[PDB]
Amino acid sequence: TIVIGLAADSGCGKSTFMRRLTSVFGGAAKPPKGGNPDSNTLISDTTTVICLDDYHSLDRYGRKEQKVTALDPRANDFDLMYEQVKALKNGIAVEKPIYNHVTGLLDPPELIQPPKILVIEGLHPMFDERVRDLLDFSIYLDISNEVKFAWKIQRDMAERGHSLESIKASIEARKPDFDAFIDPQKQYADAVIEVLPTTLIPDDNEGKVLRVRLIMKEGVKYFSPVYLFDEGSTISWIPCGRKLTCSYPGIKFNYEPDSYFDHEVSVLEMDGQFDRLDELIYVESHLSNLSTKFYGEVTQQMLKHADFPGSNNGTGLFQTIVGLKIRDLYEQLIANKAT
Amino acid sequence: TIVIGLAADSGCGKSTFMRRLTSVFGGAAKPPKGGNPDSNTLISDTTTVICLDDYHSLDRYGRKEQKVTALDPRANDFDLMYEQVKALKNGIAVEKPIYNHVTGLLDPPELIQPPKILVIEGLHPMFDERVRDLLDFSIYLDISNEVKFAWKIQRDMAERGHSLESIKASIEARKPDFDAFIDPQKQYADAVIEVLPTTLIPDDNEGKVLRVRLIMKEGVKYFSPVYLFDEGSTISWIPCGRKLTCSYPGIKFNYEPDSYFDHEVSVLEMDGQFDRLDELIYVESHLSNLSTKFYGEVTQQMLKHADFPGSNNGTGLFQTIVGLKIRDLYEQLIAN
């Protein structure tokens, strides 16, 4: 966990995901103080987060000239990505270009010092074999089209597009290269958080109530997947729940082993949204392999960030658990010395 | 004394059910040492089982000629039944008639001494309020009518010979009476074992694999129901596996609260069959409030009678567990 990789698409609350992760690690998540104001980087005393947009080879206007998207590998310089995170992993400060999302250009570099924990997040952290050989853990955030577009209506890119406050051409121009080049990276993730429309009730295009699968890879050295009641078995669990007033659809947990890109995985799934902070502390209490340090830490960490999107559903619950898992992987890896 | 009531239709495994209960409470249960070859009583060290046909008010012919069936409350004497169950509970011996099942006649009575555990088994154990109040715990062995027909067309009298086939008289006899006086007694049981067609393999009604539900009543003083993992929640559970390994039909468990006659119950459901009895000890190791005094006790009981029918499915499993939860109740009452 000296180097983490988070594959996720723009506008999927990866921002919110990054902040839950950082807080478990060291809680600061602030951009560099005196440089470019349009820097994508975040810094804490323990972790530094790098947006892989900064390794675009082609700027916005150049990408248009060649009529390739930010998702094209042609649009991204992977050789430089590889050498730079290889340098950051080995204690070497690096001169990192800055992709300016506002003006669309590749601006003068940022000087990145080598962090205790390095997170590279964006479209291609698992795309290139050389780079994932550097990663000690990898995450993929899978937002299905329905939930993506549902967030893309108001809330996320708030009905601002051009034709019916919809630039929806974007999704239909990006998705070809997205399914060609981004989605196949799921295969290399130790943890996938998959967000889908709810099996419970009829909502969307508002979203809000979600079926969130947490796919965890078995057989990866310091990662024991969380399980519910009996590991290896197939389980449904409706925690209701006298303490539980919840809810309009309620919450239903699911647990089952599965094979995922012909990798054996365990899947924990939560449908619906919880509610009382005394009633999600119930939920934590019946999961195991939460790799927490003390009782209630999942809820503690969730309560701290009680402001956050997805803080009432599996999106925040699983993102918070993934963070604790990765810190476990840290405390292990930071422990392996010395002679 | 502790008095139990076993509501059952015969041909539905009340006999087998019964032998699983007695094994939990005490020794072998055999007819009276001395008199009447065709008695229906069964005595053990601790438990006495009275078949309730012995309280018939009309014999086979009288019942026939008076145009009623065994299930008719008019063909039964609930006063005597009440007075004798009440006497046996209070430690008073009792001159209890005998319905001879071969000849269909009410033989002279037999003297029944009062046991520690009295078990009245038959059609109307909880029909009568005064009888009902004497029961410390009560059981209904329900068979879905879909299963019943399937059990008739293979077990009771499959073909019944002579080219054809089944009897209209058979189903078109007591089915009206059953649903009017028997079936409504489910409301009063603290524990109900309901047996229905299986979800797992689509059949019209084969009858080998079953879906068994054990409906238990919350609120009973000394009765803490069985639960799966997290009491009072709704849970579905396939113990296979991918860790446990099962055969062409899996096993599948369901645990949930429900409303039974507008009474609040917790239901435990087993679907499928235990092919290799290493899944039984797994399943037991995960259930809760089994009223075991030692772990694996349900298992040991089940294999001790491994050729009791229904040992490989939820029938034997739940009847065994019900037996244990009565022994718990038994020991609490005694224990002040």
Report yes or no: A182 and A9 within 8 Å, Cβ to Cβ.
yes
The DSSP call for residue B182 is I
Nearest CA in chain A to B285: A230
* 3-class SS shares of chain B: helix, strand, coil, % to 5: 35, 25, 40
| A231 contact residues in B (CB cutoff 8 A) | 243
Q: How far apart are CA A151 and CA A232, in angstroms?
A: 34
Q: How far apart are CA B310 and CA B313, in angstroms?
A: 5
In this structure, what is the dihedral angle of CA atoms A156, A160, A165, A167, given to the nearest 10 degrees?
Answer: -80
The DSSP call for residue A114 is P
Which among B232, B233, B243 has the least Cβ separation from residue A233? B243
Look at the block and give the residue holding tokens 């009275």: B50
Query: Are B239 and A231 an interchain contact pair (Cβ–Cβ within 8 Å)?
Result: no
Mutation for A interface: B200, B231, B242, most A CBs within 10 A: B242
Mutation for B interface: A233, A253, A265, A271, most B CBs within 10 A: A233
| A287 contact residues in B (CB cutoff 8 A) | none
- Count of positions (residues) in chain A: 339
Query: Are B229 and A229 an interchain contact pair (Cβ–Cβ within 8 Å)?
Result: yes
3-state secondary structure of B136: coil
> A258, A252, A269: which is closest to A233 by C-alpha?
A258
Tokens representing residue B98 in the block: 């005998």
Q: How far apart are CA B220 and CA A126, in angstroms?
A: 59
Q: How far apart are CA B111 and CA A126, in angstroms?
A: 85
Tokens representing residue B123 in the block: 């059609």
**Technique that determined the structure:** X-ray
> A87, A111, A94: which is closest to A36 by C-alpha?
A111
Burial of B311 (0-12, 13-18, 19+ CB in 10 A): buried
3-state secondary structure of A138: strand
**Strands B42-43 vs A252-260: parallel, antiparallel or unpaired:** unpaired
Look at the block and give the residue holding tokens 């990276």: A185
Burial of A167 (0-12, 13-18, 19+ CB in 10 A): middle
**DSSP string of B65-129?**
HTT--TT-GGGB-HHHHHHHHHHHHTT--EEEEEEETTTTEEEEEEEE---SEEEEEES-TTTSH
3-state secondary structure of B135: coil
Residue A143: enclosing H or E segment and its boundaries?
strand A137-143
| B239 contact residues in A (CB cutoff 8 A) | 230, 233
The DSSP call for residue A187 is G
Report yes or no: A322 and A213 within 8 Å, Cβ to Cβ.
no
Domains and CATH numbers, chain B: 1-142 (3.40.50.300), 190-336 (no CATH)
Work out how many CB contacts closer than 8 A connect A with B.
51
The DSSP call for residue B52 is G
Tokens representing residue A160 in the block: 């601002």
Tokens representing residue B2 in the block: 């502790």
Report yes or no: B281 and B297 within 8 Å, Cβ to Cβ.
no
Report yes or no: A336 and A1 within 8 Å, Cβ to Cβ.
no
**DSSP string of B198-267?**
-SSS--SS--SSEEEEEEEETT-TT----EESSTTSEEEEE--SSSS---SS--EEEEEEEEETTEEEEE
**Strands B117-122 vs B2-8: parallel, antiparallel or unpaired:** parallel
3-state secondary structure of A278: helix
